[PDB]
């Protein structure tokens, strides 16, 4: 009474104040009012608890009842928790497109989403077009990208190419985007991004009966299972349309099919905190899958 609050979107900082009574939903609704967002289903608020773990904020609960890291002001991240099946059909608003664009790019650059070198360079050139506008000989002299985080660290490491050489490659691509608007630029970035194998999938360390470490990916299209050393190749898939119920108890997940004659799929996951999030992503992705088909 009153508690200071800071929420960052990918491009802005917002300062608010809340009461001990304030629910997540209200703080969340404030953000979307300030940001002018209409496709709210994709997004959520993100915080650090007293332990130090990143957590999604529960909306139907009070904010001061969720053990947010005690500090002045309280820190939040407005971010996408769910991803569209296709960006062209589902990102109608400008701001929406912008927010997705900046988040995905950050994922690329921080090496959260795997991206090969040639595709990375083409992604960079769109982020350049979006930021610098039309290429211009007089303005964009050799070296104008020296102060830009353009390529992922993986790509810079995996070559014998120098700094300015990568920059020459991006420039060459930039020149060719000579007609493109900022809106179009961000979308082309996203259209290429969305087809990277690691795009829009949450990864979770899981186990089989033998205790073999594996990966479980939750995405828009359903669930996937990966080799522990290959996050790019799905080995077993469960499309949402084939699932009936997902639940967990302690450390064990049960997935029941629609078939009803088919057997339950079982796997294991270590921490309870992660399990809550796994559950939440499943329900949310399943919901949006169905809504797109009603």
């Amino acid at each position: 009474k009153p508690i200071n609050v800071r929420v960052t979107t990918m491009d802005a900082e917002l300062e608010f104040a809340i009461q001990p009574n304030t629910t997540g939903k209200q703080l969340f609704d404030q953000v979307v009012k300030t940001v002018g967002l209409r496709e709210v289903w994709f997004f959520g608020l993100q915080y650090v608890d007293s332990k130090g773990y990143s957590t999604w904020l529960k909306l139907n609960k009070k904010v001061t009842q969720q053990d947010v890291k005690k500090e002045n002001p309280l820190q939040f991240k407005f971010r996408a928790k769910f991803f569209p099946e296709d960006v062209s059909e589902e990102l109608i608003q400008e701001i929406t497109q912008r927010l997705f664009f900046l988040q995905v790019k950050e994922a690329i650059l921080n090496d959260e989403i795997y991206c090969p070198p040639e595709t990375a360079v083409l992604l960079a050139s769109y982020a350049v077009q979006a930021k610098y506008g039309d290429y211009n000989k007089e303005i964009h002299k050799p070296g104008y990208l020296a102060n830009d985080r353009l390529l992922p660290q993986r790509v810079l490491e995996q070559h014998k190419l120098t700094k300015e050489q990568w920059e020459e490659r991006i420039q060459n691509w930039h020149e060719e985007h000579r007609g493109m608007l900022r809106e179009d630029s961000m979308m082309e970035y996203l259209k290429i991004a969305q087809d990277l194998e690691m795009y829009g999938v949450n990864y979770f360390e899981i186990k089989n009966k033998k205790g073999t470490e594996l990966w479980l990916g939750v995405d828009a299209l359903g669930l996937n299972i990966y080799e522990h050393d290959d996050k790019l190749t799905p080995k077993i898939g469960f499309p949402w349309s084939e699932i009936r119920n997902i639940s967990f108890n302690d450390k064990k997940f049960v997935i029941k099919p629609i078939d009803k004659k088919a057997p339950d799929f079982v796997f294991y996951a270590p921490r309870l905190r992660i399990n809550k999030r796994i559950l939440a992503l499943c329900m949310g992705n399943h919901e949006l899958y169905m809504r797109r088909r009603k």
Partner: peptide
């Protein structure tokens, strides 16, 4: 990239095999 199409018994089988 789309996981190889298969039935549920096969899924449990392969998963246990890893």
């Amino acid at each position: 990239k789309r996981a190889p199409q298969m039935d549920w018994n096969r899924k449990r089988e392969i998963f246990s095999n890893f």
